[PDB]
Symmetry: C2
Subunit: 332 residues, 2 copies
């Protein structure tokens, strides 16, 4: 029923943002633009998951949504590619942000916590975005460094804010650790969706992958590093167990749906192989060379291609049977 809480928070956040944008004078486009920011509107629910009081939780949640959207509008404004009225964007951006400050400050654990947090790393954030758009990334290392400011740092501030405004029992460092790890997962997903949906090439991860400058298996490890970082943060006491399915959901979506659109025939890059002894020999074969395979007890018997018509043959214990060879069993 958390899926229901999650959808209801999203709708509350959404409504609170479109009213706000409407009353400030933003056109109906701009209003439809911000209600469309579904993940941005939903993330505040993830960040406030440690918040025991429901009333405080909804108030902090929508205040975060106001600021996150506002920042997204400022980014639209720097790119001049939405078509939207430059003016309405600048004004609606400012108006939402001021409401956010006012709302977050009314719930804070300290009168200076909000501004301290926004200031602490403002330079790393802003000069970071400038360097990101200036010098496009050309390898995983560069890419990850850029994404650590406009992705992780950007969301980590909100993380820190939800802890600052969410009353008692908020493990500050953890909420913030979750936000930074999760934001990078979400940032990769965005990058690999937008190669196509949007038209992005410079410094974009999908391109760097289609180009060779980045190896698939390295993207998989980053994603796995990010998933573990998020899982551990959510595990710190008192814990936000509810976030576990959320972390797996987004991580698995990148792995299973997005990556293949850019690697193709083999995500890993470690073409599976079967090792065995045949006719006194040592042998190893590529799962791609394997024709027929069947099971005899705990043995896996099979046929493969040695070159030309030449039909290869072998049998191994399933205990040494690569997971890939076993998939052809059930699939046969």
């Amino acid at each position: 029923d958390d899926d229901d809480k999650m959808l209801a928070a999203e709708a509350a956040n959404r409504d609170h943002v479109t009213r706000c944008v409407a009353q400030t004078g933003g056109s109906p486009d701009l209003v439809a633009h911000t209600a469309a920011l579904r993940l941005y509107l939903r993330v505040p629910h993830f960040l406030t998951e440690w918040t025991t009081d429901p009333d405080r939780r909804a108030a902090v949640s929508r205040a975060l949504a106001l600021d996150i959207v506002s920042m997204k509008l400022l980014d639209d404004l720097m790119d001049d590619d939405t078509g939207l009225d430059r003016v309405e964007l600048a004004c609606v951006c400012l108006r939402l942000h001021l409401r956010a400050l006012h709302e977050l400050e009314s719930l804070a654990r300290d009168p200076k916590a909000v501004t301290d947090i926004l200031e602490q790393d403002a330079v790393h954030l802003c000069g970071g975005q400038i360097r990101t758009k200036r010098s496009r990334a050309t390898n995983l290392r560069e890419w990850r460094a850029h994404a650590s400011t406009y992705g992780s740092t950007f969301l980590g501030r909100y993380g820190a804010l939800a802890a600052a405004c969410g009353g008692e029992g908020q493990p500050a460092d953890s909420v913030r650790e979750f936000a930074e790890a999760f934001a990078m997962t979400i940032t990769m997903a965005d990058d690999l969706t937008d190669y196509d949906r949007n038209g992005e090439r410079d410094g974009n991860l999908a391109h760097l992958m289609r180009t060779g400058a980045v190896a698939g298996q390295d993207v998989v490890d980053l994603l796995e590093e990010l998933r573990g970082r998020a899982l551990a943060a959510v595990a710190a006491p008192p814990g936000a167990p509810g976030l576990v399915p959320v972390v797996h959901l987004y991580t698995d979506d990148v792995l299973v749906r997005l990556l293949p659109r850019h690697l193709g025939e083999a995500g890993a890059g470690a073409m599976a192989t079967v090792k065995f002894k045949y006719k006194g020999e040592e042998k190893e074969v590529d799962i791609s060379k394997i024709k027929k395979v069947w099971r005899v007890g705990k043995m896996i018997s099979f046929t493969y291609d040695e070159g030309g018509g030449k039909t290869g043959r072998g049998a191994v214990s399933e205990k040494d049977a690569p997971k890939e060879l076993l998939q052809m069993l059930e699939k046969q």
Copy 2:
């Protein structure tokens, strides 16, 4: 060391505080320069802080205000998009100054919350105002003054209020604000009558309306006289900021003597 010496040094200090900040966060040399050419916006916080007696607090409140006024001015440039400067730098430096200003103003305020109370209070009037201004352009003195009362008067009045809240001990908060709102309309008109030739501005532009007959010189003269009085009055509520009397006269007379003939 007269009031002029105090003003010039306040201005130089606010400008340097602004450029260090723009530079440390990534601003390019063109952006840093742009930022320093904002003469009056860098000066104006000196006027707003005249009621503050402690000179250390006054210089601190003065530059914290400069950071935000410059910041808003950068967002303004980012919406018009006609300065030929990098939109990414404008948008990033814009946010950085604003965030630093909040942080500096809040650490100076009696009650930190008053900073966001003030900025939220009439955010809708200011922001919806700036949109309508550009949406529906002015055609007679009445409409022009209504628009200007938002991007000019409401815009500076918020800073008057912030300065009273950060200025501390005994400040007639309503009068500081009254002063800023009136003084703001006077300089907005000045700008409008200067920006016509320097920026190629027609629709809703007060100087354009003057040249086409939609607005009469005497009416403009009337408004300026009304604003001078409102400002002079505001600076005389107790305690008082007599220092601003010559300032109010300096900018009002400049509009009457140098700018109007350029149009009538």
